[PDB]
TrEMBL record, chains A, B:
<feature type="binding site">
    <location>
        <position position="52"/>
    </location>
    <ligand>
        <name>Mn(2+) 1</name>
    </ligand>
</feature>
<feature type="binding site">
    <location>
        <position position="126"/>
    </location>
    <ligand>
        <name>Mn(2+) 2</name>
    </ligand>
</feature>
<feature type="binding site">
    <location>
        <position position="126"/>
    </location>
    <ligand>
        <name>Fe(3+) 2</name>
    </ligand>
</feature>
<dbReference type="InterPro" id="IPR012347">
    <property type="entry name" value="Ferritin-like"/>
</dbReference>
<feature type="binding site">
    <location>
        <position position="52"/>
    </location>
    <ligand>
        <name>Fe(3+) 1</name>
    </ligand>
</feature>
<protein>
    <submittedName>
        <fullName>Rubrerythrin</fullName>
    </submittedName>
</protein>
<feature type="binding site">
    <location>
        <position position="55"/>
    </location>
    <ligand>
        <name>Mn(2+) 1</name>
    </ligand>
</feature>
<dbReference type="InterPro" id="IPR009040">
    <property type="entry name" value="Ferritin-like_diiron"/>
</dbReference>
<feature type="binding site">
    <location>
        <position position="52"/>
    </location>
    <ligand>
        <name>Fe(3+) 2</name>
    </ligand>
</feature>
<feature type="domain" description="Ferritin-like diiron">
    <location>
        <begin position="2"/>
        <end position="139"/>
    </location>
</feature>
<keyword id="KW-0479">Metal-binding</keyword>
<feature type="binding site">
    <location>
        <position position="55"/>
    </location>
    <ligand>
        <name>Fe(3+) 1</name>
    </ligand>
</feature>
<dbReference type="GO" id="GO:0046872">
    <property type="term" value="F:metal ion binding"/>
</dbReference>
<feature type="binding site">
    <location>
        <position position="89"/>
    </location>
    <ligand>
        <name>Mn(2+) 2</name>
    </ligand>
</feature>
<feature type="binding site">
    <location>
        <position position="89"/>
    </location>
    <ligand>
        <name>Fe(3+) 2</name>
    </ligand>
</feature>
<feature type="binding site">
    <location>
        <position position="19"/>
    </location>
    <ligand>
        <name>Mn(2+) 1</name>
    </ligand>
</feature>
<feature type="binding site">
    <location>
        <position position="52"/>
    </location>
    <ligand>
        <name>Mn(2+) 2</name>
    </ligand>
</feature>
Length: 139, 139
């Protein structure tokens, strides 16, 4: 409770975002090393990526006291988690990805705009699957 | 249309941050569902998390030439990837995590301050390991 509204809450959200991206980045770097045949480098990136998973996990555990960094909604139980995932996916397909696609098209990046539209379609599908799972949940 | 400096470059970085966090959040939610015995919700979170990994990979593919979301540095080859990883980890241990630790301590969240300090030390260790890997890289 004391954490809500603090600068530390904001720092935990920022650090969660950074560590989440670090895992994704390090896995991407590992996949590039795979193709290069840099097998030791790939293993190092995968090991450090696992460290970033633990860091992000810890940040999110502290944030369970205040809300999901992506939606502000409570998280913990599957009911709460599904409700938050639905809100996030709905934001992605309604606003974020279509907005990014329009700007990509405005700026002349047609392939990127189509990519964003593909991800809007994916987010709509994921929102609908989460909604169905929530409907079926008896707790 | 030049991607570097465009609004679309910034949107790719932002979308990458969101998809990265989505994977981390969804794996956390999947583990909560495991404990509750909600096996299908757990699998659904894991399946959707795997989709988020693909989305993040696709965003990074577009960003290779313009710069790593975390550092602004070019990425793609193992040498570039190690240089960028070192830069990012060095920022975490010299600036980001120490600053977050100081703020948490000032706000009275002593355990969280120690958590940030632990992560500063971890980032220093990551930077050191990446530096040794770069120093011996055969490319």
């Amino acid at each position: 409770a004391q954490l809500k509204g603090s600068k530390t809450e904001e720092n935990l959200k920022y650090a969660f975002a950074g560590e989440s991206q670090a895992n994704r980045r390090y896995l991407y770097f590992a996949s590039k090393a795979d193709v290069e045949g840099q097998n030791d480098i790939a293993a190092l990136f995968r090991s450090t990526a696992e460290g970033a998973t633990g860091h992000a996990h810890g940040h999110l555990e502290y944030l369970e006291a205040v809300g999901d960094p992506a939606t502000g909604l409570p998280f913990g139980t599957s009911r709460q988690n599904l409700q938050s995932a639905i809100a996030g996916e709905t934001h992605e397909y309604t606003d974020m990805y279509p907005g990014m696609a329009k700007t990509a098209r405005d700026e002349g990046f047609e392939e990127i705009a189509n990519w964003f539209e593909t991800l809007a379609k994916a987010a709509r599908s994921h929102a609908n699957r989460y909604t169905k799972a929530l409907d079926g949940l008896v707790d």
